[PDB]
C-alpha cells in the first residue's frame, strides 16, 4: 500500500460492464502495468462529466487522499487516469455490495457474521476519522464484500469529488446534514447507525413508504427506525443513540468499535436468529 498511481490510457482494459450508477458506470477489467508482464483484475469506474468541473490539478489532489487510505476495511484508490473523462481503478470486490448480499442470504446469515461486519465497518470509519476525513455516504450499499468474513467501506471521496459544489440519500443523512448540509464524523455515526439497521433487518428499506421530503419532520418529531426483529434491546439501543439530535451525544466510532466487539463475543446473546459463498453479482464476474 502506497501513494497514487497515475495510469496511461493503455495500462488497463475494460473487460465488461458490471453496472452503471449515477456517479458513472463500472467495468470489470485488468491492469497491465507498463513494464511487468503481469495483469491484475481490478474494477474501472469511469465518472461522468461534472457540473462544476475541477481542473486536472485539483481532481488530481483528492485522488491522492483517496489513494492514501490504508486500512483493511476501507477501499483504497489504486490508480487514476485522466483523459476526456476521469477513470478510477481499484481492487475488484468479488461478492458485490453488502446490501444485495444480506438480502440475498436473509436465512443464511448468522448472528456472528452481522456483529462482525458491524465491528469491521466501525473499524474502518474510525480510521477515516483518525485521518480527519468524513465519508458522507456510508450505507450498506457502499460496503463491498471481499469475503463473507471481510468487508470494506467504499466510495470514499467519490461523492465530494463531484457533489459538494452548490440526488441525496436523505434517509441515511443525519438531521443537520439534511437541514443545513452539515457533515462531520458525528453525522457519519448517524449513517453508520442506519447501515447497522439495514444489516440487522436483512436489507430492509429504511423508512419505507415515507417520502424523503417527509423525513426531516418525522425525524424532529421523535421518529426513528424500528427495533429490528432479531435485535435484543441492547443492540437497538446503540443504533438509536446514533440518531440523537445533538451530534455530540452520538456514540463515537472508537466507542462503537468497542461495543460491537464485545457483543461479537457472545453473538447469540444480542441477536436472536432462527438457528454462504455466493451472490448473483459473483455470477456476473465468472
Amino acid at each position: 500500500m502506497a501513494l497514487l498511481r497515475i495510469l496511461k490510457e493503455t495500462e488497463f482494459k475494460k473487460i465488461k460492464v458490471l453496472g452503471s450508477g449515477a456517479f458513472g458506470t463500472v467495468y470489470k477489467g485488468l491492469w497491465i502495468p507498463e513494464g511487468e508482464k503481469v495483469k491484475i483484475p481490478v474494477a474501472i469506474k469511469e465518472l461522468r462529466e461534472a457540473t462544476s468541473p475541477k481542473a486536472n490539478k485539483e481532481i488530481l489532489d483528492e485522488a491522492y487522499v483517496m489513494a492514501s487510505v490504508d486500512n483493511p476495511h476501507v477501499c483504497r484508490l489504486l490508480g487514476i487516469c485522466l483523459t476526456s473523462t476521469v477513470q478510477l481503478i481499484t481492487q475488484l470486490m468479488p461478492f458485490g455490495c453488502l446490501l444485495d448480499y444480506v438480502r440475498e442470504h436473509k436465512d443464511n446469515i448468522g448472528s456472528q457474521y452481522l456483529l462482525n461486519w458491524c465491528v469491521q465497518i466501525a473499524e474502518g470509519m474510525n480510521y477515516l476519522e483518525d485521518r480527519r476525513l468524513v465519508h458522507r455516504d456510508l450505507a450498506a450499499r457502499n460496503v463491498l464484500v471481499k469475503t463473507p468474513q471481510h468487508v470494506k467501506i467504499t466510495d470514499f471521496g467519490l461523492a465530494k469529488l463531484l457533489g459538494a459544489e452548490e440526488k441525496v440519500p436523505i434517509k441515511w443523512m443525519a438531521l443537520e446534514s439534511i437541514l443545513h448540509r452539515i457533515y462531520t464524523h458525528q453525522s457519519d455515526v448517524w449513517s453508520y447507525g442506519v447501515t447497522v439497521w439495514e444489516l440487522m433487518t436483512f436489507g430492509s428499506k429504511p423508512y419505507d413508504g415515507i417520502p424523503a421530503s417527509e423525513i426531516s419532520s418525522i425525524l424532529e418529531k421523535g421518529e426513528r427506525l424500528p427495533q429490528p426483529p432479531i435485535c435484543t434491546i441492547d443492540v437497538y439501543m446503540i443504533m438509536v443513540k446514533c440518531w440523537m439530535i445533538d451530534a455530540d451525544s452520538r456514540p463515537k466510532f472508537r466507542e462503537l468499535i468497542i461495543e460491537f466487539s464485545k457483543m461479537a463475543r457472545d453473538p447469540q446473546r444480542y441477536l436472536v436468529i432462527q438457528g454462504p459463498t455466493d451472490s448473483n453479482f459473483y455470477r456476473a464476474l465468472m
Binding site: 425525524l219 418529531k221 426513528r224
Partner: peptide, 26 residues
Amino acid sequence: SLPSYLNGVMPPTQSFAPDPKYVSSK
C-alpha cells in the same frame, strides 16, 4: 427483550418523544 410485532410486520418507524434527545424543538 425482542420486538413483539403483530405478525413480524415491523412498522415504518418507532417514536421516542417526549424524550428531548430525539425530539428537536422546531
